[PDB]
């Protein structure tokens, strides 16, 4: 249908430009405000900006001075350019579409920013053997997120990934259980993808009793 | 609130009538712009709320506030909920309101604990791991247990979060030594939730 979806870095450090990308399909690009919204872990929605095809631009008043939005009408993309980031700007990063009269009415799916400075890492993984229920420990990762998914997605039937916790360490690990039936603990095979697109890590691992 | 002000909660039962006010100024909707109304559930991105032929939600406004009401609350019906309106071109959100349906059933919750991999003592470490899902009201008290003694030091747990079933779930992680590990006959990872324990062992 109309599909919105975001790209840009997962990490940037304080004082530097986050800038991030959403590439539009399924609609028309020159009827609509293309939109920018934030959310700050644990806090309510912000107003960045729109444009319009043919340039026209508003954007939030407390974000004078540092928003650039950029159009590729032969791409359908659009961007957003944040300079000077401090902490504050930690936050999902949506894109939309404002139908200009009508409301913010597709919404992507939203990226997560972590401006820090401190450095990424990719998780190390490790198997949690076995209804039996099997999983994946992925273990001392910075920043958020990682996906993961089971037999390259076509395992998703009583799939529970849960919540990372965010370690004393600085470092956040989680764990991703799928409840399976006993039968198949030996016929069938168990891979866990895990893919932290923060360092550009992907591990397989398959898991065994 | 943020430009826009909301209640930061509210509450009702199955089937009651629920109001959410958007309060906004001369600026923004009692100069004649239209309020939006978006439903945030847990973990997605807002929806927009339409209102045409919609039988149980509708809206007011009256100066410079307007209203959502909910007729016939349905436990689905939980999310955040988030008013918008113009100020010039510029569009302000509120700041959010939690809807709560009450007299939801308590549920208990299922806990899975697993012993540190072969793989992880190979590296020198060992995390044992305690998953708690599918509980309501959302508190938990986790506690460790080495043998029969409580263990402290090394314990990682996080806070309950809302689940799309409206439960939540929550992580407890151990971290020990290998040796710590080899010395014990069991570790226990205790979850009690509205005062009934739920206790789940494992053994070198």
């Known amino acids: 249908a109309v599909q919105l979806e975001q790209s840009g870095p997962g990490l940037v450090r304080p004082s530097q430009t986050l800038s991030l990308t959403c590439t539009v399909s399924?609609?028309?690009?020159?009827?609509?405000?293309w939109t920018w919204v934030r959310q700050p872990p644990g806090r309510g929605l912000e107003w960045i900006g729109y444009?319009?095809?043919?340039?026209?631009?508003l954007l939030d008043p407390s974000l004078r001075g540092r928003v650039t939005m950029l159009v590729n009408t032969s791409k359908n993309q659009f961007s957003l350019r944040l300079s000077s980031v401090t902490a504050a700007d930690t936050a999902v990063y949506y894109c939309?579409?404002?139908?200009?009269?009508?409301?913010?009415?597709?919404w992507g799916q939203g990226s997560l920013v972590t401006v820090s400075s401190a450095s990424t890492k990719g998780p190390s993984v490790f198997p949690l053997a076995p209804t039996a229920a099997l999983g994946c420990l992925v273990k001392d990762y910075f920043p958020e997120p990682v996906t993961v998914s089971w037999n390259s997605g076509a395992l998703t039937s009583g799939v529970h990934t849960f919540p990372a916790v965010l370690q004393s360490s600085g470092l956040y690990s989680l764990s991703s259980v799928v409840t399976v039936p006993s039968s198949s603990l030996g016929t069938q095979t168990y891979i866990c993808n895990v893919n932290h697109k923060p360092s550009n890590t992907k591990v397989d691992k398959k898991v065994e009793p | 609130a943020s430009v826009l002000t909301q209640p930061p909660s509210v509450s009702g039962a199955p089937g009651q009538r629920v109001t959410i006010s958007c309060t906004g100024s001369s600026s923004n909707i009692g100069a004649g712009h239209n309020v939006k109304w978006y439903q945030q559930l847990p973990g997605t991105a807002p929806k927009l709320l339409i209102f045409h032929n919609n039988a149980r939600f509708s809206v007011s406004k009256s100066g410079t506030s307007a209203t959502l009401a909910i007729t016939g609350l349905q436990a689905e019906d939980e999310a955040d909920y988030y008013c918008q309106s113009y100020d010039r071109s510029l569009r302000v959100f509120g700041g959010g309101t939690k809807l709560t349906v009450l007299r939801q059933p308590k549920a208990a919750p299922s806990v899975t604990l697993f012993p540190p991999s072969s793989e992880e003592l190979q590296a020198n470490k060992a995390t044992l791991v305690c998953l708690i899902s599918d509980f309501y009201p959302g508190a938990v008290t986790v506690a460790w247990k080495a043998d029969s003694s409580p263990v402290k030091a090394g314990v990682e747990t996080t806070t309950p979060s809302k689940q799309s079933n409206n439960k939540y779930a929550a992580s407890s992680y151990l971290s020990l030594t290998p040796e710590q590990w080899k010395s014990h006959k069991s570790y226990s990872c205790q979850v009690t939730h509205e005062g009934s324990t739920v206790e789940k062992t494992v053994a070198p």
């Open positions: 939309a579409r404002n139908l200009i009269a009508g409301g913010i009415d597709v």
């Open positions: 399924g609609t028309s690009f020159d009827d609509y405000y």
């Open positions: 444009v319009f095809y043919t340039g026209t631009t």
